[PDB]
Design a protein around this motif. Structure first.
Motif, PDB file in Angstrom:
ATOM      1  N   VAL B 108       0.374  -9.824  10.407  1.00 30.64           N
ATOM      2  CA  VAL B 108       0.748  -9.470   9.041  1.00 30.64           C
ATOM      3  C   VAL B 108       0.597  -7.974   8.801  1.00 30.64           C
ATOM      4  CG1 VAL B 108       0.231  -9.871   6.613  1.00 30.64           C
ATOM      5  CG2 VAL B 108       0.130 -11.785   8.246  1.00 30.64           C
ATOM      6  N   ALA B 109      -0.282  -7.307   9.553  1.00 34.38           N
ATOM      7  CA  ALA B 109      -0.515  -5.884   9.341  1.00 34.38           C
ATOM      8  C   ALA B 109       0.709  -5.024   9.646  1.00 34.38           C
ATOM      9  CB  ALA B 109      -1.714  -5.423  10.170  1.00 34.38           C
ATOM     10  N   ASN B 110       1.702  -5.549  10.375  1.00 35.67           N
ATOM     11  CA  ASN B 110       2.865  -4.732  10.724  1.00 35.67           C
ATOM     12  C   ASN B 110       3.627  -4.266   9.484  1.00 35.67           C
ATOM     13  OD1 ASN B 110       3.237  -4.954  13.926  1.00 35.67           O
ATOM     14  ND2 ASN B 110       2.593  -6.967  13.173  1.00 35.67           N
ATOM     15  N   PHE B 131       2.099  -2.493   0.974  1.00 37.44           N
ATOM     16  CA  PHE B 131       1.802  -3.696   1.752  1.00 37.44           C
ATOM     17  C   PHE B 131       2.396  -4.857   0.957  1.00 37.44           C
ATOM     18  CE2 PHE B 131      -1.775  -5.548   4.658  1.00 37.44           C
ATOM     19  CZ  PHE B 131      -0.884  -6.450   5.196  1.00 37.44           C
ATOM     20  N   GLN B 132       3.568  -5.323   1.391  1.00 35.26           N
ATOM     21  CA  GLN B 132       4.329  -6.279   0.597  1.00 35.26           C
ATOM     22  C   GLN B 132       3.640  -7.636   0.512  1.00 35.26           C
ATOM     23  OE1 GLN B 132       6.537  -5.305  -1.256  1.00 35.26           O
ATOM     24  NE2 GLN B 132       7.884  -3.779  -0.329  1.00 35.26           N
ATOM     25  N   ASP B 133       2.869  -8.011   1.537  1.00 34.75           N
ATOM     26  CA  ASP B 133       2.181  -9.299   1.505  1.00 34.75           C
ATOM     27  C   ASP B 133       1.167  -9.358   0.366  1.00 34.75           C
ATOM     28  OD1 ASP B 133       2.919  -8.374   4.358  1.00 34.75           O
ATOM     29  OD2 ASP B 133       2.749 -10.543   4.612  1.00 34.75           O
ATOM     30  N   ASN B 137       1.642  -1.934  -3.888  1.00 33.63           N
ATOM     31  CA  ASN B 137       2.693  -0.919  -3.924  1.00 33.63           C
ATOM     32  C   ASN B 137       2.204   0.122  -4.934  1.00 33.63           C
ATOM     33  OD1 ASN B 137       5.125   0.579  -4.438  1.00 33.63           O
ATOM     34  ND2 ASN B 137       6.305  -1.122  -3.579  1.00 33.63           N
ATOM     35  N   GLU B 138       1.510   1.142  -4.423  1.00 38.90           N
ATOM     36  CA  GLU B 138       0.914   2.190  -5.240  1.00 38.90           C
ATOM     37  C   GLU B 138       1.380   3.548  -4.742  1.00 38.90           C
ATOM     38  OE1 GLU B 138      -3.363   1.568  -5.144  1.00 38.90           O
ATOM     39  OE2 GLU B 138      -3.212   0.018  -6.691  1.00 38.90           O
TER      40      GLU B 138
END
Lengths: 553, 553, 553
Positions: B108-110, B131-133, B137-138
């Motif tokens: 998931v880190a990809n 990080f979409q998971d 989103n900052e």
């Protein structure tokens, strides 16, 4: 005992002896920080806000002091100690034949302005001192011309002189001559003419002479600092003894911001600014500053610096004083909005029973109305001002902080980890209609619950105060006294009284009378005593079991 | 003992000996399995469900934590330790003038993304991390431009530089120059000059230079990490010091899931995804993975696996730790709906006093709304969570299971055979109108009932805990204490107080306080005692007898 | 007894005889090392940390002392002895006619700057010294000129001389001479004229001459050190008696770091540096420093070096002094992180009863934020500081060390092997939830386990202190005194008292007082007794037995 009279007499009389015995703690708070005024390496007592403002013109140390006095609304605003880290120096100049030195230390002294002039309407000198920052402005008009000397006879010649002591060039005489030889001379080194008004009065009392003091200010200069005069005619006019500089000193010795001293001849000069005002730079180590706090009297001290080196230096310093006999405690904050890892790194570094760490930083509503956003260590000051306000053996646990807002508002799990790892933290109490902020615990940086004296600030404070006060009183009272037969009973009575006072003031829980025992042997006295410690409630277990009830009619 | 003052004194004084001596196990549970989150070969402490869900993202382990904390309605949520067996690795990429690596381990880190598109209006790099998971989103900005310096002197031109150590690129000096001659310089080594605050203050003191912190991030970066300026003109510009590397360390240490490293000058680069996230592969043996729980305080441990080799490994692990002074017990389950012969085959393979086997499997209701059909070892996890919820020397016999249903509903004969063979089984109560599920026994896989210590889990638990606590306390307290005549008496008092306190808590039934015979000889201390262990009823006999009563009037 | 009066009187009188009998141990830790200050081959006693810093300016030895006093937070800071191996020498300058010499030993003294000036107003020299390393800078202004002589007579001439005597090479007479005769002589060679104040008083006796002290005042010099003057006119001159030599010795004898002594003639000269400041060679053999020790009373000693030759020499030294009635013991350590096989070697090479070997090395946090990663012998210093903190017949077994971190983390098998080879080891405990460091055992290098006196430090310390005190007291009181017929009972009373006092402080377990025997024959003091030695627990055997109890209703 006070005998009456202090000189015995052998003849028959009656003698009266009087003993005034039996007719009759503060926990002082300390601060080190930055300020725009005040001397370097100097401690000042501060209770009045006007004194603190005048001493510390402005900075972070004045704000810390104002927060401490205002961090405990429901307590007394007591004594604070304060020191300025900055190695400021004052502004000075040499002009007019006079050394000028300012009383203000730092860059602010450069704005001082001083000037000297002469007044043609009275043949007298003039001075003006101005400090625009304080809006201070004063004119000392008609300096000198202390008193006139007049002659009224018809002789051809009438002259007076002022002679000096050769070894010091100080005014020693004032001679009056009429014709070719003296009429009367006023010796100044010793006699009835130590003051110049006595000279004025005697000159007035003379038949053919008159004299009067200049009304501009009660000069009353002592005759030592008079100017030299040689064969100055009296019969022409009521001649003045000027003595301009001595009158200037007497007028401006303890008034205003500026001081004056001789360079040599003194002459006026233009209204000009001073020079040399400099703040300097702070040192690497603050430990040299703490030496001045060694024997000032205080318990809690908080430096205004988030650097770990200052913390380590104060930790060492209070440990050294503790081992000496004057124990102290340090409360320190971890910078601005530091994370748990940094707080852990600090607590792991510090790890000392006399040191306590503060995590939360936030905002305080100052008296000026500014929303002063400050670092943790200003909160540690506020906790120190609350802990100086508390009675001995009380604790800052669950006490209101009166803070406006906090940068970091924690979870229950975060608050529990902060408590467990020896960091003082704050929670935002939201469940009430009146939401507020409360301190959760007063745990120290040393992190073991085996010894509550080390783990808890209150217990340790009660322990420190008890031991110090018992040590001081026992040393004052019974060392040097006689080892009489009732010495042990007296000691026991004095310990019981002392413990009963401590129990009355709620500084201890209780003590058993039987354990108090006094053993006398040679020059020593071994004493065995027991005290039950005072403690603060920090856990309440309740068990509520319901039951049935049956009612008959 | 704590004598005061700690420094010896020879002149007349007073001495005080402060003494705080005398005034001063949770049965933790463990789980091992797989998850979509958290680092490998790292054990954590779990207190809150939100903490664990943030760390442990998802999988069977999070369900096992939820069932353990939910398998005991009438008891509290006990602390649990968890770890991930997978050999996962993080995502990492090379871009710009830095090497970037993620902290989360797994495929998931990809999806992590890092970029430094420049916003030229503010002359700073806008760091956007995504990080979409995690719906992270900052946008971060104001990297660089830490503060401004400006020159307003009367010379023709001025220039300044920051000199680094060329071999390490560590800032050591800040030099202000006119032409090639230095107006003034501030060595950035060993002192107050280590931080930007001293530079700001000292430069503000000079009338020819200005230095004010910018509102673009109050970093107060150290002076060693500042950027290298080489004779940049100052007369026309308020030159901005940047220190982009140190500004990344200050502003992004604990923000996001991104770390940074240098192989170079930082430059803008596009928003690019990271690569190399890997779940990895399982290990050949779980014995290295179990070694991380060796000294974490765990007592009950349940592997999330139904394989016989993993069960035998865990059995050897708990044997070795028990023999090493770290007593443990293990609960295991054989997959889905295994027959009685498989459970016998497993039990005869296992045959271990510290291991218990769960036969039944069923459905559970999760907080996610899933009626999760789970294998036997998840029921073993539920049972361990119930046991942890219980105190010391309690049994889980006839306690409720709070299950929704069970795949197998065993009859009386089947339950009897499962109990006799040494397997824990679960029955469905149809005797009453309010039917429920409950545990029939807590027998171990070592089938010999003649010896209840080994057979009964509660008795073994009470013995383990009593022994280990008595051994730790005796090792801490008495070793290294003098062999005085009162040592034996103090040891016998301490033993009696420990056994009386255990009796108070009902961890032990009773003991004869008169039979606590201590013998002391040299370095050895020989101690003998008797204790009646707390037991749990499991059979009741009633010999009811009927009789006839004759009434008169 | 001492009668009053001591000399007999034969007339009738009263005679008084008064008996003043009946109405009326420390442990010290030694250290040898290197530092930036202190004299060579000199045994310095230390009590205060400030004293050690001022004497020992810096270096490893001051850190060793700090560690020793910081390794016992509970116990008092006992006196410690220190010594510098380095054969340092002080800086000096053969400038002008004066041999300028500095007190400090080493190359730091070379920075000293000394120079002279003169003031023509008072006709007196000036002297300055600059040692800004210690923030030292003083100016001795207006040297000499203790008092003035002036003439008030009617003769035609007025001169004074100060005669210089070739035999003594000093000022012998001070005489007021006029014409070819002496007005009044003041012979400095004898009488009350050895000081100047006699001369000042006697000059005022003459009508023609008077004297007054100088405005600077307090010099108070010996008349024999006055300067050579022959008939200097004082008819109308207030000529100061220079007395340069005396006021040079007063302003520089104990003032500052710099002494002065003439090699030549006294003359002013400018500012010049000192030379010859030599740290000195480190001698290969430390016996040159160990033999300098004396009957101060030191017991423990740690060498600050990893060399085998140093440890052997220390072992030979302590054995020699023990045999010479001065019992001592040592603790040593080897560099950083040595493997067990090396430590086995070092123990086999020593094999001394009075030497202990430390296995572990680690890091300690000091006052000034110094994370000093130290060699093993510093840990040995920390152990010796603990031992000095502990009272007589205590041990360092299972006590805490307060170490920050450790290099070698030994497992149980490793510690077992180290203990079996007589090597003290330090362990990091993971059994408790709160982890901490602590000591394992106080086992010596000597490895005959049947001899606990040699094997165990505490038993050997107690036995040596008991034997040394007993022999000293008996030699002081009884042994070697004149023979009498009633000394056995008094000796047995004294012995019993001493045994009671030892038992009182828990230095011994018990003693059969009935078995004490004393026999006297001529001058042979025959004593025989029995003592039960003090010991400290190291093994605990708990034989627990479980039983079943039946209860009736």
């Amino acid at each position: 005992v006070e005998p009456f009279p202090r000189r015995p007499i052998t003849r028959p009389h009656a003698s009266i002896e009087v003993d005034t015995s039996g007719i009759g703690s503060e926990k002082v708070f300390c601060l080190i920080g930055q300020a725009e005024g005040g001397e370097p390496n100097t401690v000042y007592e501060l209770r009045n806000y006007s004194q603190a403002k005048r001493l510390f013109r402005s900075g972070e140390l004045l704000d810390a002091i104002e927060l401490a006095w205002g961090s405990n609304p429901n307590y007394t605003a007591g004594r604070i100690l304060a020191m300025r880290i900055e190695d400021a120096k004052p502004a000075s100049a040499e002009i007019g034949g006079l050394k000028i030195t300012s009383k203000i230390y730092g860059n602010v002294a450069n704005n001082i302005q001083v000037g000297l002039e002469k007044n043609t309407l009275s043949d007298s000198l003039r001075l003006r001192v101005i400090f625009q920052d304080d809006r201070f402005n004063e004119v000392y008009d008609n300096i000198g011309n202390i008193f006139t000397i007049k002659y009224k006879g018809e002789e051809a010649n009438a002259t007076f002189s002022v002679e000096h002591d050769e070894e010091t060039q100080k005014a020693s005489r004032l001679v009056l001559k009429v014709g070719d030889q003296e009429v009367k001379s006023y010796d100044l080194t010793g006699g009835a003419y130590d003051y110049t008004n006595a000279i004025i009065t005697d000159i007035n009392q003379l038949p053919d002479f008159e004299a009067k003091l200049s009304p501009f200010g009660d000069k009353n200069l002592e005759s030592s600092k008079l100017d030299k005069i040689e064969n100055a005619n009296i019969k022409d006019k009521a001649v003045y003894v000027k003595a301009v500089f001595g009158d200037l000193e007497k007028q401006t010795a303890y008034n205003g911001i500026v001081s004056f001293e001789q360079l040599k001849t003194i002459e006026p000069f233009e209204l000009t600014k001073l020079k040399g005002g400099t703040n300097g730079e702070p040192p690497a180590t603050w430990a040299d500053k703490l030496d001045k706090f060694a024997h000032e009297g205080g318990y809690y001290i908080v430096p205004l610096s988030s650097k770990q080196s200052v913390h380590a230096e104060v930790a060492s310093f209070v440990k050294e004083r503790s081992d000496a006999g004057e124990p102290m405690r340090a409360i320190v904050g971890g910078g601005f909005n530091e994370s748990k890892e940094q707080l852990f790194g600090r607590q792991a570094s510090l790890s000392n029973p006399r040191v306590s760490l503060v995590a939360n930083s936030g905002t305080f509503v100052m008296d000026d109305g500014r929303k002063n956003h400050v670092p943790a260590y200003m909160v540690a000051v506020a906790l120190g001002g609350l802990a100086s306000g508390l009675e001995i053996g009380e604790s800052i646990t669950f006490k209101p902080l009166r803070v406006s807002s906090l940068d970091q508002i924690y979870e229950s799990i975060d608050l529990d980890e902060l408590n467990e790892n020896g960091i003082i933290s704050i929670e935002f109490v939201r469940n009430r209609t009146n939401t507020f902020f409360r301190i959760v615990d007063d745990v120290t940086t040393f992190n073991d619950k085996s010894d509550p004296v080390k783990a808890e600030m209150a217990v340790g404070e009660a322990n420190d105060f008890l031991v110090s006060e018992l040590k001081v009183q026992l040393e004052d009272q019974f060392i040097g006294t006689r080892t009489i037969n009732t010495s042990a009973s007296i000691i026991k009575d004095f310990i019981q009284s002392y413990l009963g006072r401590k129990k009355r003031d709620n500084e201890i829980q209780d003590f058993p009378a039987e354990d108090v025992q006094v053993i006398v042997e040679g020059n020593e006295a071994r004493i065995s005593m027991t005290v039950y410690p005072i403690r603060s409630f920090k856990k309440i277990s309740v068990s509520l079991v319901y039951k049935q009830q049956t009612l008959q009619a």
